């Protein structure tokens, strides 16, 4: 199965309320493994997954050193964009940054990411070629030129292709039981009468990992996409996820409906029918 490693960074300015709030989290697939928070007491990169707690002082000291560095960088960046956009010092602004690498089933490099957003709008993004930058506007173009001049893409390329992938495979192995597990969803349906002529049919997918899943309803094999109530995949809170899809069935028509579940840890897709 393909895997990925991503680092998400969020910085918010607190005008007259101290220095910007920085929150850094790291993920391997759908599993968070580390964290840093500017408002934290420790001021250290902390583990958020058992398997990463096995890393030594060297690792924790280096990540702490590097993450605080990112923190500062984002403190500068808030001021910088504020300048680029001729914005008031009173306004609270958000800078988010994301970077990571994906590896195929072969655990080989597939793609690297390095994007930024300012107040929710894409600012700049490394293009797939790992050689060019999508500068959103004039401001983002200023940053692009700086980066083309400083040859940032080349240093990133080496990271995204080398280091990033190297650490991913390491995490993958070191946290095997967790990261290299596929929990098939525990499915089941509920039937609740909504009226004297209709009923709700809900199909459940629970305790599954990874989060990738397809949960659909069909009437006579015909898809009911337009008529299905499908919720966003929720985290169970224990490392597995949940999701449901519901349809309103006219009484006596339950048999026409089939729910279908597709998931990596499922030997063969499921087709559930109320009967």
């Amino acid at each position: 199965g393909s895997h990925s490693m991503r680092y998400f960074f969020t910085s918010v300015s607190r005008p007259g309320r101290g220095e910007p709030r920085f929150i850094a989290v790291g993920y391997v697939d759908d599993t968070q493994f580390v964290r840093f928070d500017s408002d934290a007491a420790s001021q250290r990169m902390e583990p958020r997954a058992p398997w990463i707690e096995q890393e030594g002082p060297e690792y924790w000291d280096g990540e702490t050193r590097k993450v605080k560095a990112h923190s500062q960088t984002h403190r500068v960046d808030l001021g910088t964009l504020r300048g680029y956009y001729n914005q008031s010092e009173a306004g609270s602004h958000t800078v988010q940054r994301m970077y990571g690498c994906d590896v195929g089933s072969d655990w080989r490099f597939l793609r690297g990411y390095h994007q930024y957003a300012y107040d929710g709008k894409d600012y700049i993004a490394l293009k797939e070629d790992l050689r060019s930058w999508t500068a959103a506007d004039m401001a983002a173009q200023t940053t692009k030129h700086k980066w083309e001049a400083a040859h940032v893409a080349e240093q990133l390329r080496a990271y995204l292709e080398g280091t990033c992938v190297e650490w991913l495979r390491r995490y993958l192995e070191n946290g095997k039981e967790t990261l290299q597990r596929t929990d098939a969803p525990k499915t089941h349906m509920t039937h609740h009468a909504v009226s004297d002529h209709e009923a709700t049919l809900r199909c459940w997918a629970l305790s599954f990992y990874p989060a990738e899943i397809t949960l659909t309803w069909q009437r006579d094999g015909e898809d009911q996409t337009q008529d299905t109530e499908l919720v966003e995949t929720r985290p169970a809170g224990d490392g597995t996820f949940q999701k449901w899809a519901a349809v309103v069935v006219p009484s006596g028509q339950e048999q026409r409906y089939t729910c279908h579940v597709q998931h990596e840890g499922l030997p063969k897709p499921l087709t559930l029918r109320w009967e």
């Binding site: 680092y7 280096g62 590097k66 560095a69 990112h70 960088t73 910088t80 680029y84 700049i124 990133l156």
Partner: peptide
């Protein structure tokens, strides 16, 4: 693990 180079916008 994090990137060791730290760029600024």
């Amino acid at each position: 693990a994090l990137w060791g180079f730290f760029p600024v916008l």
